[PDB]
Amino acid sequence: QKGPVFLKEPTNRIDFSNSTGAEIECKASGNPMPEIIWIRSDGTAVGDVPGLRQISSDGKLVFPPFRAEDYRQEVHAQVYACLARNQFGSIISRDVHVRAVVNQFYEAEIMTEYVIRGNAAVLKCSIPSFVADFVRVESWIDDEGNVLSFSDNYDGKYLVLPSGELHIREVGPEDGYKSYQCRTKHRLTGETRLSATKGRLVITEPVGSKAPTFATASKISSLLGSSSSDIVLLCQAQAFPVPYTRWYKFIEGTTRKQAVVLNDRVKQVSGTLIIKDAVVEDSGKYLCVVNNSVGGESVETVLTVTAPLSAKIDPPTQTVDFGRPAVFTCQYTGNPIKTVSWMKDGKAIGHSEPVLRIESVKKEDKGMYQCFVRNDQESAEASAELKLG
Amino acid sequence: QKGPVFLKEPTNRIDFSNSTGAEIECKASGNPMPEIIWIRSDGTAVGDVPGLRQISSDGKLVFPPFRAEDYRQEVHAQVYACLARNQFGSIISRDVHVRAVVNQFYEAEIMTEYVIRGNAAVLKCSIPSFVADFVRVESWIDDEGNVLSFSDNYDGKYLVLPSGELHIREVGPEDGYKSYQCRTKHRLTGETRLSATKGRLVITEPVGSKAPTFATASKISSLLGSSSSDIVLLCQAQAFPVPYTRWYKFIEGTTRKQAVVLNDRVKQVSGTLIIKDAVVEDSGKYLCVVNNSVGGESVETVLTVTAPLSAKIDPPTQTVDFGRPAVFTCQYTGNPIKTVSWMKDGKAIGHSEPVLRIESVKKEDKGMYQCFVRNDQESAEASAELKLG
Numbered sequence A, B: 001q002k003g004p005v006f007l008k009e010p011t012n013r014i015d016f017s018n019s020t021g022a023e024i025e026c027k028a029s030g031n032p033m034p035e036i037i038w039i040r041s042d043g044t045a046v047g048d049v050p051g052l053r054q055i056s057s058d059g060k061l062v063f064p065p066f067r068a069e070d071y072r073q074e075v076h077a078q079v080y081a082c083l084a085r086n087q088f089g090s091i092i093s094r095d096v097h098v099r100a101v102v103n104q105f106y107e108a109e110i111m112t113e114y115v116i117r118g119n120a121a122v123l124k125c126s127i128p129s130f131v132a133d134f135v136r137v138e139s140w141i142d143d144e145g146n147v148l149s150f151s152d153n154y155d156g157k158y159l160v161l162p163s164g165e166l167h168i169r170e171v172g173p174e175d176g177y178k179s180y181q182c183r184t185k186h187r188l189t190g191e192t193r194l195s196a197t198k199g200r201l202v203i204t205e206p207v208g209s210k211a212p213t214f215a216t217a218s219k220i221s222s223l224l225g226s227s228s229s230d231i232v233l234l235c236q237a238q239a240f241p242v243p244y245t246r247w248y249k250f251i252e253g254t255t256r257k258q259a260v261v262l263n264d265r266v267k268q269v270s271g272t273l274i275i276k277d278a279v280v281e282d283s284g285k286y287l288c289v290v291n292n293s294v295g296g297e298s299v300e301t302v303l304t305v306t307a308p309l310s311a312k313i314d315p316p317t318q319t320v321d322f323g324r325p326a327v328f329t330c331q332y333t334g335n336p337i338k339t340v341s342w343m344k345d346g347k348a349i350g351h352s353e354p355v356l357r358i359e360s361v362k363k364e365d366k367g368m369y370q371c372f373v374r375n376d377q378e379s380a381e382a383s384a385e386l387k388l389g
């Protein structure tokens, strides 16, 4: 009656501690009921590995908890996929990146910040890059035990920025007597840690006027953020007299720009711009302009706001006579889209355009067709069926 | 007999400690000998300020040492210039940016670096931005008292990069037992200090293979350098297995690129590119490509190489009969060049062109002529004389 279609596909990322294990499942419907087969990205069948990988009676793929000694790259750091098939044909799921994570040595560090009186301070909880996908800032704590937490109230002396930095407005001599530690949390184990080093501010009292200067000399950077997150664009400059900061956004591919419009969603916290509930349209090149009496400096930031990938094929099914063409159009959403690719019954077609054309249909052209859209973080698939007239 | 010409102008920038003070001189030849006045940016006359600004004995401008309480912007943060004149005419020198810098306390710090075994490590002496113009790396020293200095020998385990970072090739577990400090020099006070924190490397041994990853997620940066310096382009990537690194330069205004040609001048140290004895032509957009068996990653760096401004006029002196044409050619070198302007006996002309033509000389056109070339940071002048026949 109908070829297979996925109901439930496992997600793109399956991250887990060796102490927890994981399970992934795949569901597909069709008539007859499709068979469910676990494969690797290269199409090869996956079987059990005693103690480490198990295909269950109901077709789940299970990774039991395991000793670090028993870690195996080809099991625990591996792209899998689910294959569903019946007599009409086969479809393969989006990529499933299985990543088991063992404990690692890490120590967070807080560089000392020198900050001119009246200017904003930004303390950073430096987390080693090789644990940073899992270990993130949970909160900050001052030397008295006051806890500073993520908050939607941006109008206070203190703000833990969504990106984890501690922002301190309008620093005064009293702010240099306080010290701060950052509490980090491992999202796979739940383990929290408080940085051993006490983060310090030194508050300077310059006598000469100082034109604005940024923390670093580079005048351009790129930033990636995801849709529906609160994206932080820093602008770490200082000056005496205290500077004013204004943000602009360039019209794509031009030398002209518009002042950013601050409102309930797009906020400025001293020099820092926070784009709340981000959407793909917030993408673009931003300009932070900092001026005082003595001069001005400007820095650019290229923001890319990503969105979850998805795809569909127009039409879901078509019945085409012999000798006549079959055409499939991959309709996709999300951002970025790096590649589009096509499959027929679980095997690649050498086509990377969004419209797949089969010029003259034959008997062996029938079956299941798929387009896959991919970027660095994500993949999505759509399936369609070709019947014979 | 002849109009004034500068034998000696002071440098575009005159930075000094309040403890040191400073003195600047102008010398000019001429017959009769030219008098030498000091003027302010706006061409106005500069007079003595007791204990802060004096014309001392032989006519140079003197800023004695002073206490922070005595600081005054009108004296200590000011563009000056030299005005030399006699019977035949007047010339004005290049801008002299005088900046007195009242001493401040500072410390440098070194972040601890996590490095995959076999990869290159780069330790950074982090100098606060408010003193970065005056404080740079002098040397590094380890826990055993071994000292590492700048060297033209790029081939050892260790290299202090020209930009001050400590580079360590091919790190192994042994390298994790050492700790490092940087010694910095303040060029205004002459002071040297050891860093407030020690740097160390944590050598990691990944459980599986790891595609190349960079120190930060930013895909682009900018870098400013000066002609004749050794310019360092970092490419701080790690991978497992240890990756290989290739450098390219984009063809200006295109998507296309060419591999960097390594020779006696342009060198590669592991992943790091060093362009020695830089020239303006080295400017452009560079691409660092990092690969290993599991993947590849790339990052862009926009380099600008400046060149010092200078100017000369052709001819230095010319005697012209009445009603005949007088021509001056302003030859100049440097990068960038934002403005070209002309001056006559210390007064601006409405001429923006490098060639000044006078096609029917009067009595009044006699005197001294100057062309000025400027950018946002720098200026240069040249003088010529017009005598009548």
Ligand SMILES: *[C@@H]1O[C@H](CO)[C@@H](O[C@@H]2O[C@H](CO)[C@@H](O)[C@H](O)[C@H]2NC(C)=O)[C@H](O)[C@H]1NC(C)=O
Residues within 6 Å of the ligand: B018, B019, B020, B065, B066, B067, B068, B102, B103, B104, B105
């Ligand atoms: C230059 O200015 C600094 C102040 O910014 C002076 O240095 C301070 O001198 C006091 C003594 O009055 C010491 O207690 C401080 O430790 C010094 N501070 C620093 C940062 O060095 C210095 O005396 C001034 N120079 C002159 C000639 O007055």
Ligand SMILES: *[C@@H]1O[C@H](CO)[C@@H](O)[C@H](O)[C@H]1NC(C)=O
Residues within 6 Å of the ligand: A289, A290, A291, A295, A296, A297, A298
């Ligand atoms: C502010 O700084 C910019 C440089 O980023 C400069 O172009 C502009 O002139 C400055 N504003 C004023 C009023 O000087």
Ligand SMILES: *[C@@H]1O[C@H](CO)[C@@H](O)[C@H](O)[C@H]1NC(C)=O
Residues within 6 Å of the ligand: B289, B290, B291, B295, B296, B297, B298
């Ligand atoms: C190196 O990685 C880049 C991506 O940064 C990729 O374009 C290129 O194909 C890779 N080179 C090789 C030889 O694999």
Ligand SMILES: [Cl-]
Residues within 6 Å of the ligand: A049, A074, A075
């Ligand atoms: Cl296996």
